[PDB]
């Protein structure tokens, strides 16, 4: 079966959102007008995802954003949700002429009778994207003539620089949320860059000619140290002083790498500058993004880091106008891209099937259901964790498992770990009443070409549902190699759910 | 709920059972018992049975017993199950949900309804994730009927350590690492004695503090010791084969040797089980083993004994600096030899490589994988479309994805440019796809893609087939989809390996 009934419905005045490119925002309000199987007018239930289609098609990296409009059908509309996007399959399980195109057939009187449940027309619904809870709607172009069109937002009307209007709109979705005023950041960035070209005048001690990569980097680390003494970078100096990602040597690497890929054709064209900078490593140094967090999350500190790296790029071009102009506009856009990724709902490492990457290991739950410990029944469950490592053989010392005195137990007979198919039994001992430690009975190593499947088996004695009160941890702790001695900790996060 | 494809009736059905030391002869006089799954266990694979043969009180370093072959007279039904939850099994097999599943399997009622005319039923389950073997679960009463022959007694081989067991398991592969550990043990002793008599060796042993020093000074000193020791004629191959791969550098031998000395106390040093347990949780053993980048590089007896001999000497030098040094040549060698055999056995076993099936590809801080096994298969022999999902993230700071290299076959297989896209934490990003040649298409995201801790992408590749003609090997150059990371001028290459399969 191909139609998801749980997601299909009829509704009066069905509304959705369409991301509109610049120059079409006014025109589209006068009516919706024009694979072939999927030729239709596209919309979404989520106005923020709509805004992602609004950017200039000739300059998708750096161009202006048009707007979003809300389209509405009068009367009754059937939303038919599909469990697949393979049309050949669809037409098969829906008995249609496998010759005629799907979105053509979708708009016919015959289709709307069979599937419309008495609505005036059908709209197809599909998952918008992997990792998204939004949907996309596919409208037959002729039926789409029935839509009235309202402006939800015109980004150019805001009259803001770059893509700030679009990204500021999207930050609305999250009310943690990076909601920065980029106007302020552009202004503070300008003033700090000029307030610093005025000790910083180590421009004398600079070769001012081509030199060697190691030489340029060396001099740029010194320049970075001197720059950070300036009081207009004082907070930056404080917040970048420990984390090795934010060290002057990484600012220097970044700046050097910018200098080598930016030629004159590139620097005069913002789209081309952004494409060039977008494929470099190291931007996390400038952005203050490390270990899953956006540390530079204030307008002032972002302006400092941008201001500092603008200066270093300036210094770095002679050794290997653009710095304060197109370099800043481009970097700002990439900041906005990454901040938006971190604002969107997303499973963190070790949750669901997202891998946990640490100390050279990669661990993950094998399937989503593996990461759920079901409750409310007596009996058994099994849960599979995949484990490998990037290069040389790294040991697995054991695993820490949650236990509930009397209501949840490790099944020490079915709990085991298998290394490239070799089944290894475990010896499990309670640490206390809430934690059991299981170690392999022979040595477990993983590495390139050597993986393991840890199979965790649980036994429930009570039909009683588990209460959060009862469980201390929310993760299974896999122990890596020993390195004050401690094991590398690899965390698989689970969720307690009722059977269903 | 029953896997008919894996179920069958067979005459003289046999299987293998690994047997602990002390039970190799007595088990042959009959299968006797010493709750849903209480039964006698066996496998179709005699080398996995060998895996169950090690002394239960010294599982890391203890002796291995043997394997016996058990056979049922007459007709046996192998009933293969698709799940291992007993409750699920009794329900869906409309049978008693009070009596233990395995006690029921030996009753006449069950044997009539599921035996297909055989005298007894044996349950069949997958042996383990990553294995093509099965385990058999035999009812204890019915197992009384089993005839038991000896397949191997590892003790009767009279070899040191667990050499006999691992040499047996190496047969399964006829690449295959099949080392003569007797030779290696002998060459190792010889080199250690021959290196202990060398002029510049002993000369560098005098420059030693021979006193507890700091860690860093122990490493500096052990690094010098390593360099000096490598000039000796008996380590000459090691000097050549360790000269360039930084994993095999003197500084990693020295960090290993220091880690050994720091965790080996006096009680540990005198017990092999406890030394193996301690040594088995250290990082860096790939340095001594010559294992890196998915390959066992030290794969000759001579080079393996050179690395172990050198490592033994360095541990001897590290013990005073950071509690008798006789550990270095007794239990340290015996223990490390066991760890070698464990890892060699892992590499000898069939296994999908990184980027094959759903095995992650880890490179340059990135992790990429096919989302599902079917994603990794480009099906052929039909006109139409397919979709393939690739997961992408990175370990810490934001790393870019510049594009993907996709295969094409002029006139038969093409990239569906409208369905191919990438999504970043749910943000959908269209791609611009251009052909490089008639065999390779490059697609770039239309907005910047970064991944890192907490930011993952889903690359969705869509193919369209214009012919129903099956794709021929002579048509596809590559066997991988090439995901390009950051630019260093060359891109970080992340490979996802696919297989071409007709339809099912």
Numbering used by the authors:
A (entry chain B): 4 to 37, 47 to 187, 200 to 222, 225 to 227, 229 to 347, 354 to 516, 521 to 537
B (entry chain A): 5 to 38, 48 to 187, 200 to 347, 351 to 516, 522 to 537
Sentences from the study reporting this entry:
Diphtheria toxin (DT) is secreted by Corynebacterium and causes disease in humans by inhibiting protein synthesis. DT consists of three domains—receptor (R-), translocation (T-), and catalytic (C-)—and similar to many other A-B toxins it enters the cell via the endosomal pathway.
Since the crystallization conditions were identical except for the buffer, the crystals of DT-5.0, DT-5.5, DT-6.0, and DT-7.0 have similar unit cell dimensions and diffraction resolutions. However, the α-angle for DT-5.0 is approximately 4° larger than that of other crystals. The structures of DT at various pH values were superimposed onto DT-5.0 using GESAMT in order to compare their similarities/differences. Overall, all of the structures are very similar, with RMSD deviations between the Cα atoms of 0.34 Å (997 residues, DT-5.5), 0.38 Å (999 residues, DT-6.0), and 0.41 Å (1000 residues, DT-7.0). In the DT-5.0 structure, the TH2 helix could be modelled in subunit A but not subunit B. It should be noted that this region does not form any crystal contacts that would cause conformational artifacts. We demonstrate that neither catalytic nor receptor-binding domains change their structure upon this acidification, while the T-domain undergoes a conformational change that results in the unfolding of TH2–3 helices.
